[PDB]
Amino acid sequence: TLRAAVFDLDGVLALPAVFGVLGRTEEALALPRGLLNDAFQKGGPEGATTRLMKGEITLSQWIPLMEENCRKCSETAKVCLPKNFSIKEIFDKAISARKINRPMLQAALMLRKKGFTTAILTNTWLDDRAERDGLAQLMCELKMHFDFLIESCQVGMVKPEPQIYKFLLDTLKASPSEVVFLDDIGANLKPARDLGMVTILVQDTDTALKELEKVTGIQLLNTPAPLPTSCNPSDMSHGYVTVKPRVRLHFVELGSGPAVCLCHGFPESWYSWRYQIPALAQAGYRVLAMDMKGYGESSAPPEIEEYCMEVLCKEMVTFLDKLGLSQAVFIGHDWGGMLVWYMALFYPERVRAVASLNTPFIPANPNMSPLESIKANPVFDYQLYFQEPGVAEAELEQNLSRTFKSLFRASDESVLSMHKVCEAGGLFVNSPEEPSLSRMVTEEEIQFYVQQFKKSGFRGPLNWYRNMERNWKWACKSLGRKILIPALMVTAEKDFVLVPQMSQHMEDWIPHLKRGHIEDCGHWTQMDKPTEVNQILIKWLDSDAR
Amino acid sequence: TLRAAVFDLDGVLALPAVFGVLGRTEEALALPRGLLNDAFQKGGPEGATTRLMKGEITLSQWIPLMEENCRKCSETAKVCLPKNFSIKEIFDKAISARKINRPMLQAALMLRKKGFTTAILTNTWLDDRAERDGLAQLMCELKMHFDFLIESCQVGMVKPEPQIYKFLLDTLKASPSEVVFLDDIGANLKPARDLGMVTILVQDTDTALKELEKVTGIQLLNTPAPLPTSCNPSDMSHGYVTVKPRVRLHFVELGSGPAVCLCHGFPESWYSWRYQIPALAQAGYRVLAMDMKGYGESSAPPEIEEYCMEVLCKEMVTFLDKLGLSQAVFIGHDWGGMLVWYMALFYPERVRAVASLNTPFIPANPNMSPLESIKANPVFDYQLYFQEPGVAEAELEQNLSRTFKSLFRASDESVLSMHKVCEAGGLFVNSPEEPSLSRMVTEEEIQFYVQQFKKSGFRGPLNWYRNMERNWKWACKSLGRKILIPALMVTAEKDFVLVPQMSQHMEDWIPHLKRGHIEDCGHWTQMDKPTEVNQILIKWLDSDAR
């Protein structure tokens, strides 16, 4: 029975094969068939290419050796290479054209999800070309999804030598009959077949995957669209910044490029962005996913005033100062969405771009108490229930597992009646003691929120709602302003509190506003519809935030 | 007696004054004198400019209001503005041309160093222009050096209104007679003078500084060249990455731009880079100053093999993987310098550029034991003393304060005889019990190293020297390679162990190698000669690493 899957890189996990380019160059340049391929494999196990794949020499040392082999092969065949023939140019283009074979990666991810140990086994080189970052990015993206990456130039062994196969088996801690091996080179399949491994000659991906599902008994072809890559908390870079003597802010950090600061809502975590963090980093951004003040590993002071918008925004400005960031793009959800619109109004020089999920920008009414306003809309009653210190903490902290299982549900799965929460006496009065697991979350994801909220509970988080009067007074100073920096508003069709129609007048205050809209999406936008959130944010970041 | 110094931004801390540009534009365009200045101050306390400085409106909302005032002023004066007249263009250029007045900043730094509370008090705007980052960068660089930054648009008050002065006094917790106030606008000096504050009308910086030193009794003009900005550990962003189950790596992070990874030597800390971190971040780089494995907040496993070059390099590759960095520029010193040359040889795709301070690249001799080699040179004897587990730990951990005070000394201050350390019985046998403080370090800086080394001691650090045979075997695999990625070798004239002449043959293995050389510099390069280290690294980063 199989428990390990091994994939080659070129022609298997990455397409088109760099190898296929030598054949193409010959044809484009009307050179004799297999001339470039013959010069490439010249000297066999003693040749430049073998020394290169074993890590004896680097790619830049190999370029002149290949050019010389092309000369010898050319001389013998009584032909001539054109004046502008560049091995460097041919390979730069080939390596640059090679992209991940997404369906092969998805099959590898599915096998790993079902308990398989996965590995990449490749004949590769030490790339010291000025344009080496392109391939370094490709390897970074690919490798994260596998248990092992075995590279010939690092191990000093090459396919088809039998030793690399014995090395692979030892790395996998598996007998050859427990391993399926996919390669596009028949010669490289042989030794694995010889040991007793299941082998798949990969020509077209589709047939290889039919062969792969036939031998594993796991469906890999025609499967539903997969969820974006998520985060394992223990595999992230964790950052800590002291913004004032008693306040430290925690964040998770992934990627290089423009800083994208993610601001969660109530009662959440940096982990609410788990499906966006790998996607935004892969799209070319430096992601900073915050634990907002009162949450997770960030400080949670008890005082109500510590959570007014003015204080929260000032601390986020200090957070940037301490990291040496002149700006960040600010992306918020729910309470984080409210914070990001205020960051844009009061600190435009520090905000590269602003985006909000569900939370619209509504300017303070100077003629109405913020309290009067909340009372008018029956959907906002839960916020009045939150006013009295201790009441909501008691109910929310009673059983953490039940709290997050009852809250984190899709639009249909809703177990809570938010109509007269106060009169009913609580949020969970008609909710089961043991709520069923929503299709949006696993038991493990719930347990992460449970463990996070064990540190400070719900006081600091609830205090975000206990500054209605302070926030309103501060917001009134901005009544003559407009948001004129790049801005994105993302509405969710099925958010029954933060309804799409609440955002309808935003163009009066943000004239250049861009929009996104998500069908069949509830309040928990990021985990409800991860794929669409990522697609909307990536598209807007690439056009408006660089 | 004075204990507080207050500086204006425009025409005081930053030059040329943006105000002076309106006068210049009038002259360049042959417009009537004071036309642009008259349109700028139009309506006085009720005008657009006052609303802008109070934070009522943003700079982009103000641009059209200013254009209209220019039209009215123009009409009255029976003149005409040319077809291509752009307020936006004039201000974009003015703000962009405005740089920090370095001697004014240095005086402010000197006053703060001598116990003064310092503040910036400015009439400024909420900048929402597409080019706002330029000024955000300027404010970030300036503000870090002051106790307070008071901005009119944030406080809703403006100079010369008396309330902003009373606000300033309350922020400073100082009576007006304890405050010196520097401003380039006589009208804005008046209210501070009226309260009893010492005021300085700033025209030319030099005269203002003579007036400033006359009233403070502190020398500010003609003082020695100041040391670069250093790091306060508690004010940094601290990062933590788990690279394997029992290994976590700690780093300090500052700046945006290409990742620059700093690798210290033995027996050091991320803090050995304190004078480079703010400079490299200010030069446009994302600095990652490491605590190397065995040091500070990084894990320190006991096993010798955990510290061989192969393991250390692999973990640094994983460190990049976990942060989502396809590459970093690697800059090392002493043992970190050795690690960076090996990062370049074995992982060129992950290394954007490589630089070393003191440590040359010398290829392994396959015909000589690494032990034989070390013994041949009497300067390397201290490494033989380090071989036996426990001996050097006992001497180095005995009294931490004495250890760092004896080690961290300039070339002349040297208290250690490194000639036959073994025969003498130890490094500190002829060293005093209470060494004097070197001119390179304060008592506080020593105490930081003392507290850092209290966690894991010297075992993990000493283990870096206990893998001579493992390292040599691994290095021998690279004997056919060349370093062809951008590389910088920095020699230190007075390093008696890592002598400049040991680097003489490096061009045979790194043909495109760049060099730096530091006169009168010992082994502790970064703190011995901070200014010159920064100048050499910044110049090489801007030309070779982007």
Ligand SMILES: O=C1Cc2cc(C3CCCCC3)ccc2N1
């Ligand atoms: O459709 C929905 C469901 C929903 C739930 C909530 C919660 C957040 C946690 C505390 C109680 C209120 C807020 C908005 C919406 N919008």
Ligand SMILES: O=C1Cc2cc(C3CCCCC3)ccc2N1
């Ligand atoms: O000029 C010099 C002084 C000096 C001192 C050292 C130390 C480092 C700590 C452990 C003992 C050896 C190494 C090189 C040099 N080069």
